[PDB]
Every structure is written in C-alpha cells, then in structure tokens.
Amino acid sequence: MNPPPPETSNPNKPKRQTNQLQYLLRVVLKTLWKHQFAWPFQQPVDAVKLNLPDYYKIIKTPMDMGTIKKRLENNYYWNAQECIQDFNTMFTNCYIYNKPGDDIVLMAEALEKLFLQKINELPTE
Numbered sequence: 001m002n003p004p005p006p007e008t009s010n011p012n013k014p015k016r017q018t019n020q021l022q023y024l025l026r027v028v029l030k031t032l033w034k035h036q037f038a039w040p041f042q043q044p045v046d047a048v049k050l051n052l053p054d055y056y057k058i059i060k061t062p063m064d065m066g067t068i069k070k071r072l073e074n075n076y077y078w079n080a081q082e083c084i085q086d087f088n089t090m091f092t093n094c095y096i097y098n099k100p101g102d103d104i105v106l107m108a109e110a111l112e113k114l115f116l117q118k119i120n121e122l123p124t125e
C-alpha cells in the first residue's frame with residue numbers, strides 16, 4: 001500500500017518569493033520535467049501499480065518532481081536549499097532502491113547531471 005504523498009501545502013507556513021525559488025520553478029523544474037527520462041519521476045512512486053511491494057520498506061523519504069512542482073507553486077519552500085534537497089532525495093532514492101548499472105539509475109544520473117548544470121546558474125540577489 002502506498003503512503004500518502006509528501007505534504008505540499010500548509011496554510012500556516014509563511015511565504016516569500018525569491019529570485020532563486022522563481023528560477024527553480026520556471027527554469028530548473030520546467031527543464032527537467034520535459035527531459036526524455038523525466039516520466040518515472042513526475043509523480044510519487046506507486047508501488048501497487050508498479051508491482052514494487054518492497055519499495056516503501058526501503059524508501060522512507062519518498063520524493064518526486066510532481067511533489068516538488070506543487071511545493072514551489074504553493075510557496076511551500078522558504079529556502080532554495082529545501083528544494084535542492086528534495087531533488088537530491090529524489091535522485092538518491094532511485095540509487096538506493098535500484099543498483100549500479102540499472103537503466104533507471106543511468107536515467108536518474110542523466111537527470112541529476114542536468115539538474116547540477118541548471119543550478120550552477122542560480123541567480124543571485
């Protein structure tokens with residue numbers, strides 16, 4: 001059985017808009033979402049649909065780009081680092097659950113390399 005997805009909104013959290021958060025949504029998330037390998041990462045891992053009955057026994061901090069998109073859009077993140085950490089969690093979850101050399105690991109590695117290229121150009125101020 002799948003867990004509920006990660007929280008994406010909280011009416012009590014303070015909100016702010018920074019140039020880095022705007023770039024994370026309008027550039028970073030947008031670019032990764034369109035990538036040829038993005039589709040397995042566009043929504044929470046559905047262990048029932050995918051027949052992965054051990055997924056949530058191994059992965060205790062699930063994360064995905066659909067969740068990250070919602071967090072950015074809802075102003076859930078206060079610090080750009082929170083969003084960067086969620087992307088890192090997504091990539092590392094793939095490396096944890098799978099094994100070196102698996103196709104899905106190669107795909108995650110390619111998305112991670114593109115992610116690092118884009119966050120290298122995070123704006124200042």
Ligand SMILES: O=C(O)c1cc(/N=N/c2ccc(S(=O)(=O)Nc3ccccn3)cc2)ccc1O
Pocket residue numbers: 039040041050103104106107
């Ligand atoms: O949930 C998903 O959508 C999901 C998708 C997965 N896709 N695996 C794939 C998807 C595509 C390919 S591929 O046809 O493009 N071949 C490839 C791709 C990269 C490197 C080497 N070979 C190879 C494996 C693997 C696990 C998953 O859970």
